[PDB]
Amino acid sequence: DMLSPLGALRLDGHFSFHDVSAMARDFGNQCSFLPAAVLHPGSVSDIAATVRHVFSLGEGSPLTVAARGHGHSLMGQSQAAQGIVVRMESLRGARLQVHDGFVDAPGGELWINVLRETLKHGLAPKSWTDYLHLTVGGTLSNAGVSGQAFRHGPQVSNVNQLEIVTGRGDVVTCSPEDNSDLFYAALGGLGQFGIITRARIALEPAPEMVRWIRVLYSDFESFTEDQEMLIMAENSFDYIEGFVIINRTGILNNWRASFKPQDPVQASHFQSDGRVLYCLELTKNFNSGDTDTMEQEVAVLLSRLRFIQSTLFHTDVTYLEFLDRVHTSELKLRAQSLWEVPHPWLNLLIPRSSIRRFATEVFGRILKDSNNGPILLYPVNKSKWDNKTSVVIPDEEIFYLVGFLSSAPSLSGHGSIAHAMSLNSQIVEFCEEADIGMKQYLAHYTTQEQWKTHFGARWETFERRKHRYDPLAILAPGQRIFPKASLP
Numbered sequence: 001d002m003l004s005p006l007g008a009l010r011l012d013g014h015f016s017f018h019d020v021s022a023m024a025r026d027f028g029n030q031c032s033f034l035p036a037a038v039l040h041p042g043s044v045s046d047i048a049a050t051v052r053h054v055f056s057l058g059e060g061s062p063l064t065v066a067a068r069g070h071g072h073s074l075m076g077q078s079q080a081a082q083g084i085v086v087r088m089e090s091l092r093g094a095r096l097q098v099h100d101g102f103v104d105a106p107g108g109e110l111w112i113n114v115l116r117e118t119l120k121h122g123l124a125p126k127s128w129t130d131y132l133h134l135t136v137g138g139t140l141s142n143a144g145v146s147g148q149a150f151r152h153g154p155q156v157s158n159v160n161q162l163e164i165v166t167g168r169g170d171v172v173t174c175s176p177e178d179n180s181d182l183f184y185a186a187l188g189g190l191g192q193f194g195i196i197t198r199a200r201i202a203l204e205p206a207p208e209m210v211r212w213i214r215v216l217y218s219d220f221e222s223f224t225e226d227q228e229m230l231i232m233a234e235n236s237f238d239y240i241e242g243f244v245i246i247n248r249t250g251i252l253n254n255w256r257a258s259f260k261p262q263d264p265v266q267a268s269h270f271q272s273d274g275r276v277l278y279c280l281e282l283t284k285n286f287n288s289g290d291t292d293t294m295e296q297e298v299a300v301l302l303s304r305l306r307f308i309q310s311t312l313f314h315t316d317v318t319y320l321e322f323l324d325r326v327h328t329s330e331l332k333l334r335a336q337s338l339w340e341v342p343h344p345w346l347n348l349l350i351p352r353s354s355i356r357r358f359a360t361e362v363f364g365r366i367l368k369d370s371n372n373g374p375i376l377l378y379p380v381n382k383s384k385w386d387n388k389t390s391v392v393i394p395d396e397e398i399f400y401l402v403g404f405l406s407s408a409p410s411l412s413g414h415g416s417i418a419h420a421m422s423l424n425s426q427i428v429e430f431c432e433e434a435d436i437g438m439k440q441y442l443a444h445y446t447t448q449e450q451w452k453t454h455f456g457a458r459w460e461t462f463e464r465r466k467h468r469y470d471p472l473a474i475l476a477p478g479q480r481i482f483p484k485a486s487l488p
């Protein structure tokens with residue numbers, strides 16, 4: 001019995017061995033791997049003791065440890081087949097502190113909760129993700145990208161310190177100045193180097209309100225040129241995003257529910273039918289007193305753009321309302337029982353030079369419909385992403401985030417996980433064949449060889465960090481990069 005010495009451990013928290021099924025499922029709703037045990041931690045000491053114990057068994061044990069945040073992984077990257085899942089959200093106690101324009105947040109804290117606390121002090125993190133019901137540890141283990149990364153970099157670029165439980169069971173505090181290798185390694189580290197029990201996140205003064213803007217484009221070349229210019233512009237918009245709208249009808253009437261149109265007369269006629277359209281989603285942060293300054297400031301920035309004048313829809317919402325926007329969507333989908341469905345997502349990082357080529361085969365040919373799920377498309381600046389981290393990004397100075405955020409509500413037909421799978425396969429096949437120079441975000445490779453190809457020249461550094469902080473490959477088994485007890 002390998003789980004009997006687990007039950008022996010005098011934990012602050014405790015282990016669950018039978019009711020473990022929720023830990024055997026994630027957002028992707030495709031991979032299910034039954035863990036042997038679930039640690040409900042009462043302290044970081046409990047996580048340290050558990051990893052220490054697994055380590056103490058050396059190579060001759062199949063035991064693995066997976067930390068679970070909010071389980072937003074797509075292919076079981078938060079799961080542990082016949083191993084231990086650490087329910088990070090279970091880590092309770094007043095550990096969320098704001099000081100010196102920083103917030104020290106536990107690894108299992110949700111960004112929405114970090115924001116709600118941080119606003120009580122008139123501050124807020126600089127960079128975000130589209131959805132805030134995600135853990136600090138889970139996004140930092142990836143990158144954490146929204147429409148602020150062009151300016152502040154991903155979330156990984158706005159972290160000052162980390163408390164990590166290494167794969168040896170060591171509780172280490174690290175930053176650019178002390179244990180710096182471990183610090184840079186964990187960021188975009190896919191949970192391979194240890195468990196992020198705490199993180200210090202940079203804050204900025206929070207605006208009270210946001211002017212949330214949406215406009216349409218019929219020409220990609222114009223849509224992209226306008227995007228690339230706003231991300232490089234001085235005193236630009238606070239958030240910059242975009243979406244591809246394929247074979248969808250009356251999209252401006254599907255906006256009127258939330259947004260107000262600048263000239264409702266021309267907008268009422270505009271047909272969305274049969275033509276691939278492109279949406280530019282912008283925001284300008286402002287405080288009530290500064291409403292007038294902002295209106296003039298926005299008008300100037302919009303005046304340099306090439307969008308369809310009638311399509312300009314806008315709304316004025318509170319900062320929090322704009323940041324939590326996806327939770328509203330989540331709530332609707334939950335009501336229609338459309339939230340716990342397979343999500344065969346494809347998240348791509350496309351270099352600027354390949355974007356027009358990419359959009360030609362993908363949106364023009366490969367895809368006849370987008371109705372199945374939204375398509376995100378937006379450029380970012382490489383200058384804002386540190387090369388000391390584990391984050392895999394293309395070599396160009398400007399690269400695009402392309403996310404096919406597709407759902408499969410059907411067992412046959414168009415969606416249908418097998419249809420989604422094929423379309424995903426085709427896009428990937430084309431990116432290789434046509435020399436796009438694409439790199440995947442939230443990758444789900446099953447073999448070390450596919451991973452080595454992914455990291456490329458970064459592989460040596462990754463395997464070096466791996467042997468260093470997790471020699472027995474105990475941590476984040478579902479990433480599938482390192483088999484248990486594998487390193488040379």
Ligand SMILES: *Cc1cc2c(cc1C)nc1c(=O)[nH]c(=O)nc-1n2C[C@H](O)[C@H](O)[C@H](O)COP(=O)(O)OP(=O)(O)OC[C@H]1O[C@@H](n2cnc3c(N)ncnc32)[C@H](O)[C@@H]1O
Binds near residue numbers: 071072478
């Ligand atoms: C579901 C979803 C995901 C998503 C998104 C919107 C939705 C609805 N929008 C995103 C966006 O705007 N930008 C972005 O960068 N990512 C976005 N995502 C994806 C999401 O960030 C990730 O799924 C991420 O993993 C965060 O989610 P979560 O907190 O739920 O963590 P996890 O899914 O359980 O596990 C992720 C991996 O990291 C390891 N892990 C988890 N916690 C830790 C800690 N504390 N320390 C170290 N490693 C950790 C897991 O084992 C797993 O490998």
